[PDB]
Amino acid sequence: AGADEERAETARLSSFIGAIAIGDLVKSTLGPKGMDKILLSSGRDASLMVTNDGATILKNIGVDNPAAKVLVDMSRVQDDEVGDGTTSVTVLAAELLREAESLIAKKIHPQTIIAGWREATKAARQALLNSAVDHGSDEVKFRQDLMNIAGTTLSSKLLTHHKDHFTKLAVEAVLRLKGSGNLEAIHVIKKLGGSLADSYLDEGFLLDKKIGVNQPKRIENAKILIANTGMIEHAEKEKMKEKVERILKHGINCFINRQLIYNYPEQLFGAAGVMAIEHADFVGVERLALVTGGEIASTFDHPELVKLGSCKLIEEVMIGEDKLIHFSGVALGEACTIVLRGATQQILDEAERSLHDALCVLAQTVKDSRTVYGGGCSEMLMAHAVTQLASRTPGKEAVAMESYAKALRMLPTIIADNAGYDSADLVAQLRAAHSEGKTTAGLDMKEGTIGDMSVLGITESFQVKRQVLLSAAEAAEVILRVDNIIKAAPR
Amino acid sequence: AGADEERAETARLSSFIGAIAIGDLVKSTLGPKGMDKILLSSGRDASLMVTNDGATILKNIGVDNPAAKVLVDMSRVQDDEVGDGTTSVTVLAAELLREAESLIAKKIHPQTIIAGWREATKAARQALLNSAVDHGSDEVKFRQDLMNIAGTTLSSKLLTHHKDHFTKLAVEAVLRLKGSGNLEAIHVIKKLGGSLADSYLDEGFLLDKKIGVNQPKRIENAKILIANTGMDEKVERILKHGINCFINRQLIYNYPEQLFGAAGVMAIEHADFVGVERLALVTGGEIASTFDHPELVKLGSCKLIEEVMIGEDKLIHFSGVALGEACTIVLRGATQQILDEAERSLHDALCVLAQTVKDSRTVYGGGCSEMLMAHAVTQLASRTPGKEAVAMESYAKALRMLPTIIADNAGYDSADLVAQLRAAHSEGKTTAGLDMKEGTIGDMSVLGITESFQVKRQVLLSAAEAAEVILRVDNIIKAAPR
Amino acid sequence: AGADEERAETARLSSFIGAIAIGDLVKSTLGPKGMDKILLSSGRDASLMVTNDGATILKNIGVDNPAAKVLVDMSRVQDDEVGDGTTSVTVLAAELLREAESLIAKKIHPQTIIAGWREATKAARQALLNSAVDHGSDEVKFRQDLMNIAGTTLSSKLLTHHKDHFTKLAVEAVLRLKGSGNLCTIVLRGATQQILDEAERSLHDALCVLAQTVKDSRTVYGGGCSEMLMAHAVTQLASRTPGKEAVAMESYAKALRMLPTIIADNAGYDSADLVAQLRAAHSEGKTTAGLDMKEGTIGDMSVLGITESFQVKRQVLLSAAEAAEVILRVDNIIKAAPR
Amino acid sequence: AGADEERAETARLSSFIGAIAIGDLVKSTLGPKGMDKILLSSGRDASLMVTNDGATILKNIGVDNPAAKVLVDMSRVQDDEVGDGTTSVTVLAAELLREAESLIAKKIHPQTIIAGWREATKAARQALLNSAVDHGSDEVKFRQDLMNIAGTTLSSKLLTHHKDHFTKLAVEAVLRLKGSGNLEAIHVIKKLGGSLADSYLDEGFLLDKLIEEVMIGEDKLIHFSGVALGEACTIVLRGATQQILDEAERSLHDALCVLAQTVKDSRTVYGGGCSEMLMAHAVTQLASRTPGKEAVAMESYAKALRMLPTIIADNAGYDSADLVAQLRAAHSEGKTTAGLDMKEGTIGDMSVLGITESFQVKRQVLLSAAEAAEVILRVDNIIKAAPR
């Protein structure tokens, strides 16, 4: 009593139930006809933060008891390896559970169907490189850099009326990112105050702080000082004197501190030609250590060679309407900053959320040099090949391979259902065009029938389709073989 | 009581439950290694009744409120024009309902799904498309009359060591039963004397009664008289007719008995009414009332009536009959549990064979039809339009369970059998199927197992076509009072 | 429970509820894709019965406590002089009740609204002119004899695949029915009992429609062509009349809009895509153009040949206003002592 | 039973219920015979607050857990651009999901239905921009300065028996206000005293050439006036006595923005419901005119306009059914000037009355109504964890 017993049939059900509940919320998200979802919570949750990206919201919060959090957890590894585009990997894993009900029909050890996943491993082989994919994301690329998949990621979001322009900007960010050093420290801030562009690109880093109105406007061959400690009247001057004596030899051009700064030094900095920052955020500083070669913040000894300072251009310029400063010209080159100035339409803030996906979608396109045809083109093609395959295998092999094949049929149907036209007409015409040999043909939702996907400009990352195939099959597989989910009682 | 009110999700579920309950019981029954079962009830039921034949038990009982009896009632129509071989019609129809859970997910128009039933005619082609079976059955057939399908009905049944000879006899019964005389007038009984043949065939109707020790041995150009009212005037107009035999359903008065012997007329005491009703159809009939009944009011066929010792007991044989619609078979046997079950087999044999002659087609048994059928239908779900295709593909996997059930009852491992089974059927051999004795796969034709083509057609027509109305219905079946 | 006696807001509802319950079963009856629906009952009922025609099944049995059986009884007299087409009189009469939810918020004399029915005579005459009526006919007629309204009556029925062929057969019967006589034997396929006699009463409706086609000398374009044209004109009409007349005018007019929507949905195409394109063709002035269901868009009805009898449209227009009118005027149907 | 669970019919229902609750309270408020309500909360609230203006009360309180506060927030942005007249934007939005009963029987995808809002933008723009014109008003303008929009804004406000005159005054404030620099610097205070005029204008600034304390009716105040610069001036309001009078603090703040919009838009549309009926006649054809996805979408939007004629008529006490019928007839005919005359009880010439409304009131409501509403049906449940 209370140990946590699930009885044969029921334990499988908990896995089953987890997959069905998640799929319904996420399906709305997929495609140009996708929707934003907003969640509101109290306490340390400021306001309803709306996440159109299914992956970000699911593991921020562990809503309930049933097992699915780890399955959700895996998607992040997937996210690191390619991210989003649109969230489809969770859906494919979930739909495989429906056939599990039919797996009690066999009334044999469920494990032989596991070999189906062996088949799935080789299913991936025919689920991959089975007619057409785009090929060749070279490097930099004047036009294919965007205006394609990113637009599709944005399509599920309705901010696309002006936002598709923002999405285009994010590829420029990835190209500068390229070099020796992985994707690191990219800082992007949504800003209140509208403009048609909805974004201006900065070559450095933005921090919104100012010492005071007085002080020199520019600093050259700048040296940056960061302190972990905060800053009869003649005695006060001595603190001033120590700060200046060490400061002059170095040539110090800027000072940034995470905590409160004493007023006396502020006056000294303006005359010297040095700009200081009061209560600068720690997060910007840590990012900075990566960028400038860093240093270690100590007491006033901290000047000279115990600290290192990079020196290109540091200045405060008007960005939008809010006064933020730029740090740039990092010798290391490992990390860079992205700046956005949006419209401010309850659709701007959304841009903050949308470009998170920008790091993920574009970076893969860069390394992968491979993709797939969107609008479900990949799924119908794969489905035609798989149904015939089950008879090819000896027999044990056949049951599992065929069940996997029928799963693909539903995906075309889901895209058609959300298009306003019933899917019965759609699948017949869809299959006829795919079986024909035209990989470009796909689901045209605006048309209401079938059309050429490439003209539309919708494409899917190649990694999302190959990685999901091997991963979902095998991940699904661990669940089926586990008869019971065990909770280690209280404590 | 009125009309039962159910809507949408809930209404469908009641139909869903009826199909699953019936399928589990019928499941053990199928094939050579099928199982005999016993049922107990209360009220107007005596003790235990055991029927290997699924159809017989279903007709007798309408136990509860959920829908299923109308479906069950239909199988009798199926029997009249085939029905049996082995019971399998109920099982396939039931598996149709499992797919309905997936239908809610589709969330559009369940009626358009009905068009899958339009595809049912294709199923009539395709289900039986799976490779060529047989083609002759010209009519009567001196050699092709049996020694195939009848044996298969019997194979499930224990009696096959000598029974297979008895089943062979049954086709002869069907040949006289062809055309449209309706499905009526077939009489069978068993006898205590033992022989290798284990059965006999009579050209006429058998009755077991005698007037008394005195009276003539046989009659010719016989006139038959049947009276509703008992004997409890007769000679003067009896002579006029030429009366050869009198049959009365009840007690008979002793005085006329002396008179009949002198006249040369053979009468029957306490004749059973059921024999009498059939006989009237047979002899052109008559109208039975008071002693005024003789002459023209009475019609009598005139071949010959005689009493013949079978070997162990005395019986009376009626033969000829001008009309020709009704005929009888008298069985006897070795004297075993198996002999008693001969009753089980003849009823099954008459119907199986009757359609064997006019069907024009048969199918390979032992699951041969089912595996191949699964292979052909899987390709088509992809070829056909979306939603109708969704219903069609699910149906295809249904065929898979039958191969599993046949191997499983034989004691061999179900998993291993499925893999090896499919490869044989996939290759293209019509003959190859499940050999339970072997434990693997083999040639079905050598076994001699075949199924009537229509047994297969109405297992699926009920599953299909009629199923158009299943989602449509909403409110089903009960009683029929007093 | 505890003794039922309903007044004002909830008393109105019982009339309201009866109309909605009946509509769901009958709505599927209308349009080219419809539901056959079979019912099986207890007590001297032997088997499941199939009747496509909504009116007779309602006649056969009185299933429950709420008032509607008398309303049901009336539809048959309609059958005697014209009867069917598709069963729209029960649903449209019921349709008027949904709007009444709006009326509680109106809180101004519901009774004034009722007088609109009196003014419905004005609406009935509006329906004439609007109806979109053809030429042709030419008595007997080699090709336009059918493949039209009978097809519409039967379009709804599932059996349209095979049955549209035998719908065609019935006009041959009407041609023999013409000439000095006013209003031979035909055999159908069906289930078994008294309920089978439902077919006699149900198919009573099909024979009469065709008979009228030969002696009407007038007919209208089918497939919804008549309905959209009438809708565009009626919107003007509320604006074309004095304010007392206009309120009962304009509300009646939007009702016509729903028919186009039901027709397109059952076809297998998006329901509202059809609505845009449909209105534009009728507005232009082509009476021939209408709803092409296989196409999923709009096309020439005349090429299809589908037409509806002038009488079916003439009578329905007059009948709809009179049947609906009596319900608002009359109480809640009970009182007067001894129960 | 007794828990918060939402799926299928119920998830949609929370959006539905929020809209119906707000509409009943706001419907009374619109029109000359408009009504103002009193709200009482004891938790750290001084007493009952009374707000005639729908926007001010909705912003103030976040009483319940169901979505509606976000919907409320959107109306003020509209106010900055233009805002008021009568509170109708919230009412129209609420009636929009009313049709969703039909939608369950629409038997397809509700999301496709969503393209209604995209359609809504087209339907919305055509009648704002295209209507018969006001033709006059070059600058400052002697007699055409008021007795127009302000009269309509105050129509929903009961004070109109004597406050129509008060509203006349507000344009005079705008004429001085417009020019080389900034919008604002306007202060308004009401005095408890009785006089036919009901209001006074001050050369300078009023705080409670020459500085003195006089006596206005009742309360003592100090007046700074006769400023050499002349660029800045202040308005002092007076009133009869009631809940209605406090309305002026909220009304004037809204009025300054309205008035500013009127001077540099150079465009106006007819008030009294004239604009809405014309749009309705034109929009019914548009769903037809558009391709397909657009049609379900555009037609649903069009019927939303029908309620405005009814809401304006209902307050008057006249039969709502009769009014809608006659209204359509005059607008269809081609007379834009004709509209709803509440004192008349029927329809009349709006231009003779002088009632007109700002071009901005019509463009901002419609452009945001489509995109802002679309975002809300974009999201259904709005899932919460509860914390703190």
Side-chain angles (χ1 to χ4, degrees), chain B residues 319-333:
Chain B
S319 60
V321 353
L323 180 140
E325 290 180 350
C327 286
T328 300
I329 300 170
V330 180
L331 300 180
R332 50 180 162 152

Side-chain angles (χ1 to χ4, degrees), chain B residues 226-241:
Chain B
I226 300 170
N228 290 339
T229 177
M231 300 290 280
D232 290 340
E233 70 180 350
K234 291 180 180 168
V235 61
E236 290 300 300
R237 299 290 180 248
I238 241 175
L239 180 61
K240 180 180 70 176
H241 199 196

Side-chain angles (χ1 to χ4, degrees), chain B residues 11-83:
Chain B
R12 180 176 61 80
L13 180 150
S14 292
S15 291
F16 180 90
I17 190 170
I20 190 170
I22 60 170
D24 290 340
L25 290 341
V26 298
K27 180 180 180 281
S28 68
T29 300
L30 290 80
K33 300 297 180 186
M35 290 102 190
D36 290 332
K37 309 300 191 168
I38 60 170
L39 300 180
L40 181 266
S41 200
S42 188
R44 55 163 59 201
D45 295 310
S47 51
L48 299 310
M49 298 290 290
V50 42
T51 310
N52 190 266
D53 186 350
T56 300
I57 190 280
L58 290 263
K59 290 180 180 96
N60 290 338
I61 254 68
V63 170
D64 60 340
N65 113 65
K69 187 180 180 175
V70 283
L71 180 150
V72 170
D73 183 350
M74 199 260 185
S75 187
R76 180 167 51 89
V77 170
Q78 177 22 7
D79 290 340
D80 180 341
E81 290 180 3
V82 80

Side-chain angles (χ1 to χ4, degrees), chain A residues 302-331:
Chain A
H302 64 67
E304 70 180 352
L305 40 280
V306 300
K307 290 180 180 2
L308 300 330
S310 62
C311 46
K312 208 210 94 59
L313 180 62
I314 300 170
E315 60 180 344
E316 180 180 270
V317 210
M318 290 180 180
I319 300 301
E321 300 80 11
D322 229 70
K323 290 290 190 63
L324 30 270
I325 190 170
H326 299 81
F327 180 90
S328 70
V330 30

Side-chain angles (χ1 to χ4, degrees), chain A residues 210 213 215-219 275 314-317 323:
Chain A
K210 190 180 180 176
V213 170
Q215 257 82 77
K217 180 61 60 178
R218 290 180 183 227
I219 60 170
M275 180 180 53
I314 300 170
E315 60 180 344
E316 180 180 270
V317 210
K323 290 290 190 63

